Design an enzyme around this catalytic site. Structure first.
Site, mmCIF file in Angstrom:
data_model
loop_
_atom_site.group_PDB
_atom_site.id
_atom_site.type_symbol
_atom_site.label_atom_id
_atom_site.label_comp_id
_atom_site.label_asym_id
_atom_site.label_seq_id
_atom_site.Cartn_x
_atom_site.Cartn_y
_atom_site.Cartn_z
ATOM 1 N N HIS A 1 41.493 47.064 34.775
ATOM 2 C CA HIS A 1 40.284 47.383 35.528
ATOM 3 C C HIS A 1 40.406 47.022 37.008
ATOM 4 O O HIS A 1 39.427 47.177 37.750
ATOM 5 C CB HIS A 1 39.046 46.738 34.889
ATOM 6 C CG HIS A 1 38.952 45.249 35.023
ATOM 7 N ND1 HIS A 1 39.024 44.592 36.233
ATOM 8 C CD2 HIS A 1 38.720 44.292 34.091
ATOM 9 C CE1 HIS A 1 38.874 43.294 36.038
ATOM 10 N NE2 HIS A 1 38.686 43.085 34.747
ATOM 11 N N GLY B 1 36.805 37.602 40.741
ATOM 12 C CA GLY B 1 38.160 37.505 41.227
ATOM 13 C C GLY B 1 39.083 36.668 40.370
ATOM 14 O O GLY B 1 40.296 36.638 40.635
ATOM 15 N N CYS C 1 39.757 37.280 37.263
ATOM 16 C CA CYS C 1 40.437 38.150 36.314
ATOM 17 C C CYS C 1 41.937 38.157 36.574
ATOM 18 O O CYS C 1 42.387 38.105 37.721
ATOM 19 C CB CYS C 1 39.872 39.567 36.413
ATOM 20 S SG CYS C 1 38.166 39.625 37.016
HETATM 21 C C1 LIG Z 1 37.079 38.762 35.669
HETATM 22 C C2 LIG Z 1 35.817 38.537 36.480
HETATM 23 C C3 LIG Z 1 35.041 39.824 36.619
HETATM 24 C C4 LIG Z 1 33.799 39.683 37.530
HETATM 25 C C5 LIG Z 1 32.989 38.319 37.341
HETATM 26 C C6 LIG Z 1 31.729 38.166 37.946
HETATM 27 C C7 LIG Z 1 31.014 36.970 37.784
HETATM 28 C C8 LIG Z 1 31.549 35.908 37.017
HETATM 29 C C9 LIG Z 1 32.803 36.047 36.413
HETATM 30 C C10 LIG Z 1 33.511 37.253 36.579
HETATM 31 C C11 LIG Z 1 34.963 37.471 35.917
HETATM 32 O O1 LIG Z 1 35.336 36.810 35.001
#
Ligand SMILES: *C[C@H]1CCc2ccccc2C1=O
Ligand SMILES: *C[C@H]1CCc2ccccc2C1=O
Ligand SMILES: [Cl-]
Lengths: 306, 306
Positions: free
Chosen positions: A41, A143, A145
């Protein structure tokens, strides 16, 4: 003595973390040999995440659209493919810090260390468990991820998790390093609720053994029980059913302490029916279930990784 | 979202850990530039530890008596000196993995990450706090001495602790990297009891703010209080007295959440007088006091270290 929630040393994985940017988003990738792994993604806009067709979105992506940066030096992407929910970016430079490693798909109840990263740079390390409902109770911001979970045995890093999503309830979902999600979750911003967060019974018992080893013994009663009778209590409190396989895995801890597994089950039984009456066990006021039997032996013996 | 007990990435410190052996004991040392730091009781037999005269014991030690090994390659000791309770072993090779670093003496209430090592090899990482009684609640076995505690800001490792002793009650004592013990403890196997383990009030408040930020808000009441009136309750429950300095440090978290510090104090007050009635806060059934305000902002913002 003393018992702490302990992660593996993070150095070997730090050397593998890179930043991946695709037009819109920047998240983390894992650089092993000449391949960078990251959540697919990354190719999405936050608008796309509502219902993305990843195959179609990928058609408009070429090698040079993926910007990969280790520290402050760019890496050259010479190929890309989608495997399930991960992208594999082939680069022209093998990571010189690649550790000995394996990809493992872990089972619910197993624990691992997460190296939370942002922009390809490590921020912290903590211990987690794959919940029976196939979520993990992590600490992740936007961020994060592409951060990974791992175990270290000997000189070999066993990668078992890549972080992908945060569900509306604040728990976390992700894949193995082959891109297959744990549990029924998908990389889409939709309604996907978690199931019952059942307690990992075998881990609670392991932690009770760790308590006995480290001085805390007030919860040891005079009772015993049977698997079938204990499980009747476990079910009521949404505990995993205990099996003979679980008993066998606890054998080493039962031998070290001289407390039969079923005697420890009878102590757990009383704890569940009567609570802890304001007492504490290893500095906790609830029953901890994110220590495996292996974790307890490892920390109480001082195992080394080289 | 989510809140976890999070340590700093361990890689930079792993590269500094070596094994130090003096005739009898083997413990850990810290290799920075061309100096190896280790506890001075490496020169002791477990018999010596009852009442050692370190100066006299050192007279019978020469450079070549100290065996220092990084991984599996020997280092050459070209000088040695005792500074307070640490030995400084001058070696002929500067550590090529030396990070940017400082030595810091931390104050009670401050937190740090410990890299537990055995035989110069890292075993795990976890977060601790310097208790108000100048102990730390760690996880240490025999041979863990010389393990260090640290904080990472930016590219700089701030070393603040070296592990030396385990007290008979199972808590841990040690020095800064200049060899001065925290608190009144000495590197001798004797009767030295710990004082009151008071709770770090400012850290509890910080963690309550982290709970609000991450969804848990049932404990927010309709009350407020004053510093003087809250401290009357704090004293009763063996909490650190809260000062205006503590209030000011909580300002950023008060601003982020819109909850005035004194309103949060009134919520803590009710929690101490009425307990948590079987509820939980950020997965804990007690009030956590080993998160600093800095720790909370760091984990809730995603600060990076390079
Ligand atoms: C992997 C990211 C995606 C976006 C996000 C927004 C708010 C809190 C955690 C996350 C993630 O884990
Ligand atoms: C530093 C070492 C000294 C010896 C020891 C014995 C048992 C448990 C912990 C320890 C240490 O911390
Ligand atoms: Cl923890």
């Amino acid at each position: 003595s003393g018992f702490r929630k302990m992660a593996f040393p993070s150095g070997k994985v730090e050397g593998c973390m890179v930043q991946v940017t695709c037009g819109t988003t920047t998240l983390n990738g894992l650089w092993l040999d000449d391949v960078v792994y990251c959540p697919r993604h990354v190719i999405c806009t936050s608008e796309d995440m509502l219902n993305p067709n990843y195959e179609d979105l990928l058609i408009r992506k070429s090698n040079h659209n993926f910007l990969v940066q280790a520290g402050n030096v760019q890496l050259r992407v010479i190929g890309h493919s989608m495997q399930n929910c991960v992208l594999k970016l082939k680069v022209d430079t093998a990571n010189p810090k690649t550790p000995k490693y394996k990809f493992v798909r872990i089972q619910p109840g197993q624990t691992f260390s997460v190296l939370a990263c942002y922009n390809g740079s490590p921020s912290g390390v903590y211990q987690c468990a794959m919940r029976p409902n196939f979520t993990i109770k992590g600490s992740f911001l936007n961020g994060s991820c592409g951060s990974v979970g791992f175990n270290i045995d000997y000189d070999c890093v066993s990668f078992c998790y890549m972080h992908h999503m945060e569900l509306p309830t604040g728990v976390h979902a992700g894949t193995d390093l082959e891109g297959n999600f744990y549990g029924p979750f998908v990389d889409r911003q939709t309604a996907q609720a978690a199931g019952t967060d059942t307690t990992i019974t075998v881990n609670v018992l392991a932690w009770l053994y760790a308590a006995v080893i480290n001085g805390d013994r007030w919860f040891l009663n005079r009772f015993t029980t049977t698997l079938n009778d204990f499980n009747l209590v476990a079910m009521k409190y949404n505990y995993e059913p205990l099996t003979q396989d679980h008993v066998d895995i606890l054998g080493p801890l039962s031998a070290q302490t001289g407390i039969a597994v079923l005697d420890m089950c009878a102590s757990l039984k009383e704890l569940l029916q009567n609570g802890m009456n304001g007492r504490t066990i290893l500095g906790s006021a609830l029953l901890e279930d994110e220590f495996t039997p292996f974790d307890v032996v490892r920390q109480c013996s001082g195992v080394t990784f080289q």
